[PDB]
Amino acid sequence: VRKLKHHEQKLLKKVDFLEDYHKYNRICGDIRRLANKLSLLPPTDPFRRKHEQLLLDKLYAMGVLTTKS
Amino acid sequence: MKIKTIKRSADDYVPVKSTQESQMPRNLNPELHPFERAREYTKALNATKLERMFAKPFVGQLGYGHRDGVYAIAKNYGSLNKLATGSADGVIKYWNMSTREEFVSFKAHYGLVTGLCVTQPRFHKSQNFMLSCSDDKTVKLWSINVDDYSNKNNEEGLIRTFDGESAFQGIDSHRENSTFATGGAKIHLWDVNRLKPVSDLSWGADNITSLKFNQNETDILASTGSDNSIVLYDLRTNSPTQKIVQTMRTNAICWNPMEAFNFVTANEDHNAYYYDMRNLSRSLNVFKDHVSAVMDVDFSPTGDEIVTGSYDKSIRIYKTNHGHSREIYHTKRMQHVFQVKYSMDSKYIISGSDDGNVRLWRSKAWERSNVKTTREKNKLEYDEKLKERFRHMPEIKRISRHRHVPQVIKKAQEIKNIELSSIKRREANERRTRKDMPYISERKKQIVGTVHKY
Amino acid sequence: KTRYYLEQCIPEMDDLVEKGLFTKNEVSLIMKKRTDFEHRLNSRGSSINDYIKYINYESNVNKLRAKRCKRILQVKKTNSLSDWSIQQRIGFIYQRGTNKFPQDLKFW
Amino acid sequence: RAGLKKIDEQYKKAVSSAAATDYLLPESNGYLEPENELEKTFKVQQSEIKSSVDVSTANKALDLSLKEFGPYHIKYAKNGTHLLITGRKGHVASMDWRKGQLRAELFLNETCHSATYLQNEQYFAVAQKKYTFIYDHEGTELHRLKQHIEARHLDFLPYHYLLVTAGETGWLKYHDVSTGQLVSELRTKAGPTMAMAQNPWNAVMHLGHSNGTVSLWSPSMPEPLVKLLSARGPVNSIAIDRSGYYMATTGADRSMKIWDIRNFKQLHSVESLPTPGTNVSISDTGLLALSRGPHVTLWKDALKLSGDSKPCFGSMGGNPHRNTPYMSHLFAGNKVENLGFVPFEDLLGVGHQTGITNLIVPGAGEANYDALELNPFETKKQRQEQEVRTLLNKLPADTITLDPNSIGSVDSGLRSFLRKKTQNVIDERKLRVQKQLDKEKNIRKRNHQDVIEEALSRF
Amino acid sequence: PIEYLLFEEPTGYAVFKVKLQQDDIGSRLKEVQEQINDFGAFTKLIELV
Amino acid sequence: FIKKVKGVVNKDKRRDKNLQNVIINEKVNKKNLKYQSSAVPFPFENREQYERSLRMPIGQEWTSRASHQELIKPRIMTKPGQVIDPLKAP
RNA sequence: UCAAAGAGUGCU
């Protein structure tokens, strides 16, 4: 729509409905979620310790992690 | 056969000239205009929201004010932009409210300026005159050079002095003729061309705190006493007429400019009372919103509104027919409202507080002073009737009634509401057993007695 | 405010149809022409010639009405609004043009 | 009396003044009047009508041959300036059909079911496969409505800025285009939705179901407002007139029924349909359109309470009372998908397998529109100003009701523990006091309203 | 209370009639000062006679 | 011991009674308190008078130009720049 | 060019 005048803006707001990194953002968020759920698990669980290492190895192999972390 | 179809001539709907206005065909068939009720309501809700964001009542203050608190304001009833003010410093000023600058300033009295009124003396355009009284026991008549007209081209200053035996506490001038009345220890009637009071009016020994002439029946005068009494006078009989005593003192009286028999009183019990002259045993209305003593009251010249100033640092505007204010004006810099007046066009309110400043306010905060087009005046008029139609809608009340009230006034009201409900629950308990405890009309509780019974 | 002027024509048009001088179809044609003139007068670039055309058109409507009065009603003057409506309207156009264009001595 | 009377004259004077403005209407509607009694209006053919009408009217009767991505569903803009076509195989085009100007053309390789314009022709929505997409004037995808799934029927409430979807999941969902938030999502609990129509007078939605019922819905209520049994099988199509007074339905049982939806009274039950009806439309003037496969049949003055107005196929010896078809047309070897009367035009748009056709129907459109509401000659400056003011005056979704005139009717440590005990005793006293007050009132109402036993009565 | 205005020009004397009277108490308010600058608003105040 | 519990509508007061093939859910047709006036506005002295006024729409979509002007005209009207003098003797 | 979006000028 056309630019709203001063008074029109006050009466109605947020009516402006109707390079993108959405997919990469989803990957970064998904990694964070997977790391978060892993932390919730008991520290001593071998299942937890194995999968976090696999996540480190995958990201290392992909190259997003320039050094082991 | 007979075949006819919709046929549009482009020239009728699209003008050939680029400067011509395109025809705007209208069809008032209700089938083409659904949701009349919902649309009218939504427009009213928007107009209510717009009215709040446009409410900007403060316009400015007159000059640098007074050195001491302002306790007397007098308007010129024949000139729209002229104002007279006096302060506890003993100084009186005459103002040009258009430029917000003084015509002149006088050190008039040694004591307090206890009264002020603008007059047009008829001694037996180029100059205006004002009468001031003080507790130094003198009344002085002053002349001010004004620039209303340029028909001439001085003698600006003190013209006459009236010495009194007692202190003067109030002054007002008869509209038609040159006589003026002063109320001090006794209420006196004066003529401009005599140095001693012309007539002595007084119910008795009690002193008179304020007085106001009637605006239509110009021979009728009302005064306020220190014994919580209101006395009515008539100059045609040169005598007082009626006297009623109230539970508390009344500070100011104003007569209705459109109903000669109606006047309002500013009272010390937080209330302003509306009275009929002919029947003073009850009040016509009660105005109830202030939380401290009401110090001054004034009618709009249209007679449909009153403005009250209070000791609680606020100004309230009432409709004469409704017992609660439609508006409250306040500022951190305003300290005790002792005077309020309406401009002779009814579009502005002048207040005088004891911080020494004379402020100007819009009678309606959302209005503006510029000339409008018909297309504005129609749109603004349409919104007013539309807001009037849907006043009691649950949303429109919430937006429209909301005001930013100072926390002192809001808390004083809440404590006041608890106190009243404590009284009511106690009288309700008393009626469960007391056989004869009469109902007292809310319009009669403030009257303690009247002299002439009817 | 072009619609304000158009609605003032309605009582006359109704009177014309009631008296039978003009049909509803014919009245619609007359008001179509008036609508065009009113927009022309109320727009930018309007000249005195626009007023003269509208005065000239209104005069012809008056002549046509007068003839259908004797031809149909068989009366010199039918006591109704239609008799003095056009003449009053024409004088109003002259006032508007003179106020708009005081310089033109021809229109005065 | 005086107060109530004075309001009446104020009301009567207003209605008379509004009626008096009908003298300013710039034009009048069309017709198909027969001259001779033998001449029958439903014998007239589109070839004959095109000959009589003017050049512009004939040029409006557009035909578009689209042999590939059909069948095609049509939708004209509310002012009739733009046409939206969606092919079943996924060809969606938006154009100004008078000036021959194409605003968008999408070749989605997907099954498209329907499309509608939003508040104006600059924005439109398409009910594609599994999702509903919104597009720009130029065809750029703006949003993919992930919540609206398997929607087959789309509609837009203009005064409420609401988009409505229905489909096989039995979900009715309302979407606010201005704010882009799901206003309400309702479970129909009646299986797939077969038809959908809005009532333009109160903005209530009418869904058809397989059980032969029509339900009425509002976004703010979790259950249907009304339920109407108007078929012995699934309801294929629903049509509602501009006034919102009448409703027409056609089920898959060779049944067509005209309803009075203000009072909920059935007026006509036309059971003489040779084949099941597929679509029904009602024009601004009230013409009733029906499509049965390749046939299109029109009726005039059929939406009336009179029994003579009942639609009839053919005539019984030319009986005047029988309401014979007003007009008819046959698309040989071609099925009709949907019908759209062109707003403010004497035209009926028809979507079919081959493409798009406009039939000239005299006396079908509203000759006199109101430019404050809808303007076919609107400029872009007027269009964008109308966009802002219609958005300022958006009606809330919860104002939608069965009756649109509803609005406006009068109607620590120890110290904490010790504080708890006192407040408990304070509350208890309030109950004891109220019990005594209630008892005393009962006494007021009571007061307001064997020889041996007499002897011993004093004891 | 102004009804006629006298203006002197190099070419002659012009007399105007005040149609509408502007607010006096609000004379210094910006909106009334803007109306003086705007021709459309000014013509509503006076007209040449 | 039986307690009568008020329902949405008595079975004998239903609107859909005597309407064949129609079900009207009175539970969802209840009027919204959000849009009911708390009291009768001034100057209408009775509820009936107030309800009559609402039937007449003031807006110009439903009214002629001239009829619109009369409806929107306020009772108190004054002209700028002049002093309102007290009412003169009749 | 059309097509959507701004910012000034003249004028009713």
PDB file of C-alpha atoms in Angstrom, chain A residues 8-61:
ATOM      1  CA  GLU A   8      -3.131   6.472   9.837  1.00  0.00           C
ATOM      2  CA  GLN A   9      -0.016   4.870  11.315  1.00  0.00           C
ATOM      3  CA  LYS A  10      -1.270   5.411  14.873  1.00  0.00           C
ATOM      4  CA  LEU A  11      -4.727   3.945  14.226  1.00  0.00           C
ATOM      5  CA  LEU A  12      -3.500   0.834  12.385  1.00  0.00           C
ATOM      6  CA  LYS A  13      -0.037  -0.722  12.623  1.00  0.00           C
ATOM      7  CA  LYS A  14       1.759  -3.779  11.255  1.00  0.00           C
ATOM      8  CA  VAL A  15      -0.509  -3.952   8.198  1.00  0.00           C
ATOM      9  CA  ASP A  16       2.499  -4.391   5.881  1.00  0.00           C
ATOM     10  CA  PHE A  17       1.703  -8.044   5.251  1.00  0.00           C
ATOM     11  CA  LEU A  18       1.069  -9.281   1.725  1.00  0.00           C
ATOM     12  CA  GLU A  19      19.704 -12.876  -0.428  1.00  0.00           C
ATOM     13  CA  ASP A  20      17.745 -15.193   1.878  1.00  0.00           C
ATOM     14  CA  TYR A  21      19.500 -17.453   4.394  1.00  0.00           C
ATOM     15  CA  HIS A  22      16.405 -19.204   5.752  1.00  0.00           C
ATOM     16  CA  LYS A  23      17.657 -22.718   5.004  1.00  0.00           C
ATOM     17  CA  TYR A  24      21.112 -22.159   6.493  1.00  0.00           C
ATOM     18  CA  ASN A  25      19.450 -20.518   9.496  1.00  0.00           C
ATOM     19  CA  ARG A  26      17.392 -23.688   9.912  1.00  0.00           C
ATOM     20  CA  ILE A  27      20.572 -25.794   9.862  1.00  0.00           C
ATOM     21  CA  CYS A  28      22.236 -23.615  12.502  1.00  0.00           C
ATOM     22  CA  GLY A  29      19.114 -23.695  14.660  1.00  0.00           C
ATOM     23  CA  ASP A  30      18.692 -27.442  14.214  1.00  0.00           C
ATOM     24  CA  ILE A  31      22.302 -28.006  15.291  1.00  0.00           C
ATOM     25  CA  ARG A  32      21.669 -25.854  18.364  1.00  0.00           C
ATOM     26  CA  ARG A  33      18.485 -27.774  19.181  1.00  0.00           C
ATOM     27  CA  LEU A  34      20.258 -31.116  18.789  1.00  0.00           C
ATOM     28  CA  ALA A  35      23.109 -29.926  21.014  1.00  0.00           C
ATOM     29  CA  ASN A  36      20.589 -28.642  23.570  1.00  0.00           C
ATOM     30  CA  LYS A  37      18.658 -31.917  23.802  1.00  0.00           C
ATOM     31  CA  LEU A  38      21.967 -33.763  24.138  1.00  0.00           C
ATOM     32  CA  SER A  39      22.880 -31.612  27.146  1.00  0.00           C
ATOM     33  CA  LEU A  40      19.570 -32.489  28.820  1.00  0.00           C
ATOM     34  CA  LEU A  41      20.584 -36.156  28.760  1.00  0.00           C
ATOM     35  CA  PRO A  42      22.590 -37.525  31.718  1.00  0.00           C
ATOM     36  CA  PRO A  43      26.293 -36.706  31.231  1.00  0.00           C
ATOM     37  CA  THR A  44      27.412 -40.286  31.882  1.00  0.00           C
ATOM     38  CA  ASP A  45      25.224 -41.843  29.170  1.00  0.00           C
ATOM     39  CA  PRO A  46      27.408 -43.550  26.518  1.00  0.00           C
ATOM     40  CA  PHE A  47      24.647 -42.861  23.986  1.00  0.00           C
ATOM     41  CA  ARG A  48      24.981 -39.132  24.650  1.00  0.00           C
ATOM     42  CA  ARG A  49      28.782 -39.164  24.525  1.00  0.00           C
ATOM     43  CA  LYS A  50      28.802 -41.065  21.225  1.00  0.00           C
ATOM     44  CA  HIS A  51      26.349 -38.848  19.335  1.00  0.00           C
ATOM     45  CA  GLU A  52      27.875 -35.526  20.366  1.00  0.00           C
ATOM     46  CA  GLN A  53      31.231 -36.767  19.062  1.00  0.00           C
ATOM     47  CA  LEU A  54      29.565 -37.785  15.796  1.00  0.00           C
ATOM     48  CA  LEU A  55      28.103 -34.276  15.534  1.00  0.00           C
ATOM     49  CA  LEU A  56      31.569 -32.788  16.087  1.00  0.00           C
ATOM     50  CA  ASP A  57      33.021 -35.137  13.472  1.00  0.00           C
ATOM     51  CA  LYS A  58      30.339 -34.402  10.862  1.00  0.00           C
ATOM     52  CA  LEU A  59      30.722 -30.632  11.222  1.00  0.00           C
ATOM     53  CA  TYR A  60      34.503 -31.015  11.181  1.00  0.00           C
ATOM     54  CA  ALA A  61      34.295 -33.096   8.000  1.00  0.00           C
TER      55      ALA A  61
END
